[PDB]
Amino acid sequence: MELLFLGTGAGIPAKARNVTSVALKLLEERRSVWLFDCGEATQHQMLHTTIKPRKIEKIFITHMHGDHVYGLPGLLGSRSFQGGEDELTVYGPKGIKAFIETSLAVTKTHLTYPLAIQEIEEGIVFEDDQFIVTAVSVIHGVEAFGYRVQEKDVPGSLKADVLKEMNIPPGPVYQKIKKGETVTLEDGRIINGNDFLEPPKKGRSVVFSGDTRVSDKLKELARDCDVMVHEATFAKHSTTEQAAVTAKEARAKQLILTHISARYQGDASLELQKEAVDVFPNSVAAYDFLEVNVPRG
Amino acid sequence: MELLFLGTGAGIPAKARNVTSVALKLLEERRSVWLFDCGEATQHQMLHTTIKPRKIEKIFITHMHGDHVYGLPGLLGSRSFQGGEDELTVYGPKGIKAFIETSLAVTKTHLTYPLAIQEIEEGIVFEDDQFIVTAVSVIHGVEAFGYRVQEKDVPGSLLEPPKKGRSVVFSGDTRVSDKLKELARDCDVMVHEATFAKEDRKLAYDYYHSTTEQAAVTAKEARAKQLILTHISARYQGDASLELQKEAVDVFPNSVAAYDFLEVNVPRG
Ligand SMILES: [Zn+2]
Ligand SMILES: [Zn+2]
């Protein structure tokens, strides 16, 4: 699991930073990538990476600002042009449906894959046996959402070499053992499946703020998360400091600041980082193509 | 008057070429720039030029395919973000209004300048005392147009010799069209798509595009003075693009394969 920042700017594109988009790579976990926001030229940034449109499974939009969505039509179109056939779901605030459906309609685009669009509300926006994503209205009167991607604890992996070494060849019995069932082997031995499973893997979690302002809702949303990705500036100081205080109180493990305006160049960026670091040591001022690993434990 | 190619690639963005957009720089003639088509990231390409969003006075869209229009919302947005107050007019086929209006409404974008959207029809789309811009239906499946930008002739100045208006023709996306060559009669510069190589007449037909040879032949029969090939598939970049060029050169000597950031001057003949 890794975060690959495709665009870390704000408002409008700059040679140094494209408008916002962060890729949550889950190749090992689901053979896919999930995108958080999708500003114009996001697919162009991807051309400089190993990420292809076909690998994108989901796209989550935090706010209906142009610098967060104008890259969607193009990305959806390229994925179709390239022959992607897997389903893709877009989650976003009200208006995302119209934006997408109207764009694809006027450009006479016929997708080669199933496309699901969900206009979200505070609560659980997606869940399966592996992950659960919750969305929260961060700022009191704002049509923006923060998201928490929570990887669920993973059942302990099977100690297959030990089984083979006990002369228990791969097959149906492996499934029962995996479930913790007691099994009767071909030679008559009785084996307790649980004795052959490693401890469960604790799920990791990444939180995406969606707005520069902070709140208690943000703090609780990010409680004990591995990485908190926050928008540091408005496209137009204490903001960063507050983000850092929030991460500290929420006990997040790492704070990454993105959505940095042109006003901050070169050293200015490092000063932004320093502001956060003074409160929360493990803080980062993201930059385009930065990649952050999210290890278990 | 110069042509600045911002994006010369076909269908989808490639590291080598971005999707379609050609800037007709008229700084000396009108103190502005006109854009023909606006694919995604056109504004990003502009960041590598001296052209700023506020200097864009008009945008002409050949057809509604994404690689020719997805850059509009961003560009219009940036122009506003940056304080532009001059009117901007966007011309395009039916649906262009819905595309732009929806995009701006869902993002609650309030432009700092007046925006006019003209859903065109074959014929004259714009005319003032200085220019006459005409559109003609081309062959591309979806409703598509080709454009001719005709600078009007002017009397000499206090006397100076008269000035013959220059002309530039844009094919947009299309299969070989007679109406195009007919509209492009005696034009100074013809910008024509060449999505496929000479020997790919079949693929060209199927995807409603043209070949290098077909473009060259159009220029030749229309008596254009210069031909510029654009909308190149990612299958011919680097020196392979030179091969495409040569195919054209063989029919029409004055032919050039465009590439991102290529700037071509349009001299008064
Ligand atoms: Zn095209
Ligand atoms: Zn087309």
Tokens 């390229």, residue located: A78
Nearest to A12 among B12, B78, B95 (CB): B78
Q: Do A44 and B48 touch (CB under 8 A)?
A: no
Count of residues for chain A?
297
Residue A249 three-state SS: helix
Q: Do B77 and A12 touch (CB under 8 A)?
A: yes
Q: Do A96 and B106 touch (CB under 8 A)?
A: yes
Q: Do B48 and A15 touch (CB under 8 A)?
A: yes
Helix extents (H) in A59-95: 66-69, 72-81
Sign for the CA dihedral angle at A147, B100, B19, B26 comes to negative
Centroid of ligand 1 to alpha carbon of B225 (angstroms): 24
B86 in active site: no
Centroid of ligand 1 to alpha carbon of A283 (angstroms): 44
* Number of the ligand closest to the Cα of B64: 2
Give the homologous superfamily in CATH for domain A2-297: Ribonuclease Z/Hydroxyacylglutathione hydrolase-like (3.60.15.10)
Residue B237: burial class (beta carbons within 10 Å; 0-12, 13-18, 19+): middle
C-alpha triplet A154, A160, A163: angle, nearest 5°: 130
Helix extents (H) in chain B: 42-46, 72-81, 96-106, 178-183, 201-206, 212-222, 240-251
| Residues from chain A contacting residue B109 (CB–CB below 8 Å) | 66
Which residues in B101-180 belong to E strands, given as ranges? 115-119, 123-127, 131-137, 145-151, 167-170
Distance from CA of A45 to the nearest CA of B (A): 9
| Residues from chain B contacting residue A11 (CB–CB below 8 Å) | 81
How far is residue B80's CA from residue B92's CA, in Å, rounded to a whole number? 21
The answer, for A61 touching chain B at a CB cutoff of 8 Å, is no
Experiment used for this model:
X-ray
Phi, psi of A154 (to 5 degrees): -95, 130
Assign residue B248 a region: left if phi > 0, alpha if psi is -120 to 50, beta otherwise? alpha
Instruction: Detail the residues of B annotated as belonging to a binding site.
Output: 63, 65, 67-68, 140, 173, 231
At the topology level, CATH places domain B2-269 in Metallo-beta-lactamase; Chain A (3.60.15)
Centroid of ligand 2 to alpha carbon of A257 (angstroms): 39
